[PDB]
Design a protein around this ligand. Structure first.
Ligand code: CL
Lengths: 203, 186
C-alpha cells in the first residue's frame, strides 16, 4: 500500500494541476456502471469534456458506444488484480489532462477496492437491487468509503423481491454522510439528481 | 464470473490435496497479527510428530506480485513440492479484505487478530471474519496495557460467526497456544 499511497498523491496533484475532477466508480459487475457512464456522456458530453477509464471488461458494442461521442476512452489492463490501483492509471492520466471530468470504472468487485486510493476526488459505489437487499449490510467496508451511493434498477425491486427502503437505510446507517440516489435509468428516476451531483463537483 | 478461473484452480488444488492426504490451512490476519510467529512456534512444538509444509504470503515464500491476496494459482504451481506433507500452513497476505473472495482449495480458514489492532477490528471487517472456521485473538496479555476490550472482540466475533471456534492467545505466556494445538491435532 505504501507505493500506492505515493503514486496516489502524484495522481491527485496531476489531477489538480489540470483541473480534472476524477470519480472512482465502484460496484459489482451488473451494477450498471458502464451504462451510467454512457448515459452521462450522452446528457452532458456537449457542455463538459469527459474522459472514461474502463476497468471492467467492456464489450465491443459498449466501447463503440462510448467512443462514438468522440470521447477519449480506454480499457484499463488490470491483469491479476481484483481492483484498480494508483499505478494502473499513473501513466494514463496525461492522455486525459484535457478532460473536465474523468469517470473511472473500477473492477466488478465489492471488497478489494476498499484500500486502494487512486488519487480520485470522489468515490461512488453502485449497487443494483437484483444483487439482493442485504448486499449493503454484507459489505460495510466499501460502502463506508463512498461519497455517493447509488441504488440501481429500482423499478425491478418488486419483481425481484428486493426491499429498496432497507437498502437505503442500511446505506445510511453505515455511511451517514453519503448522498444516496435511488436510480432507474429506464424510467429516468434519479438521473437528474446524479447529473446535478456532477455539476456540483465541477463547479 | 470474474473468479471463474480462481474457482477452477481451487477445485484442482482441492483435489491434489485430498489425493495426497495433505491438509491445508489458510491463515489470514493483519500485517502484524502475528501469523509468522504462530507458525514458527507451531513447528517448534509438533514439527517432530508430523511433516509441515509452509507457504509465506507475507517451506517457501510465495510471490504475490501485484496482488493483495493469495490466489489458487500461486498455490497450484508449488503444490507438488508438498504432496508428501501432513499439514500445509498457508500464511496469507497481511490484509483483512482482499483474501475474502479467494478460495485457495484449502480445508480450513483461520483469521488471526492482535488486540493491538483495536477492539472494533472485528466489527469493521465482518466479511473476512465470516469465512473463518477459527478466530484467534492474539497478544491478549497486552489488552489492558493498550486499552482493548477483549470481551468486546469476542462478542463481535460470535455475533458475526456463531459456528466459528474462538481462542484467546498470547505467545509471551503460551496462553491459548495449547488449544491451538488441540485444534490442529483434530
Ligand atoms: Cl489483487
Amino acid at each position: 500500500l505504501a507505493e500506492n499511497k505515493r503514486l496516489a498523491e502524484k495522481n491527485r496533484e496531476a489531477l489538480r494541476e489540470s483541473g480534472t475532477v476524477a470519480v472512482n466508480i465502484m460496484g459489482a459487475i451488473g451494477s450498471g456502471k458502464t451504462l451510467l457512464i454512457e448515459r452521462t456522456i450522452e446528457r452532458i458530453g456537449n457542455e463538459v469534456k469527459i474522459g472514461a477509464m474502463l476497468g471492467d471488461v467492456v464489450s465491443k458494442a459498449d466501447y463503440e458506444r462510448v467512443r462514438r461521442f468522440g470521447i477519449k476512452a480506454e480499457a484499463i489492463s488490470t491483469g491479476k488484480e481484483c481492483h484498480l490501483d494508483a499505478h494502473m492509471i499513473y501513466h494514463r492520466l496525461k492522455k486525459f489532462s484535457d478532460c473536465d471530468l474523468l469517470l473511472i470504472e473500477n473492477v466488478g468487485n465489492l471488497i478489494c477496492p476498499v484500500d486502494f486510493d487512486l488519487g480520485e476526488n470522489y468515490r461512488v459505489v453502485m449497487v443494483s437491487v437484483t444483487e439482493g437487499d442485504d448486499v449493503v449490510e454484507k459489505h460495510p467496508e466499501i460502502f463506508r468509503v463512498a461519497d455517493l451511493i447509488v441504488i440501481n434498477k429500482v423499478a425491478l425491486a418488486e419483481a425481484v423481491g428486493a426491499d429498496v427502503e432497507k437498502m437505503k437505510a442500511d446505506a445510511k446507517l453505515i455511511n451517514p454522510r453519503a448522498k444516496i440516489i435511488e436510480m432507474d435509468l429506464k424510467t429516468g428516476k434519479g438521473f437528474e439528481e446524479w447529473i446535478d451531483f456532477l455539476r456540483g463537483i465541477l463547479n
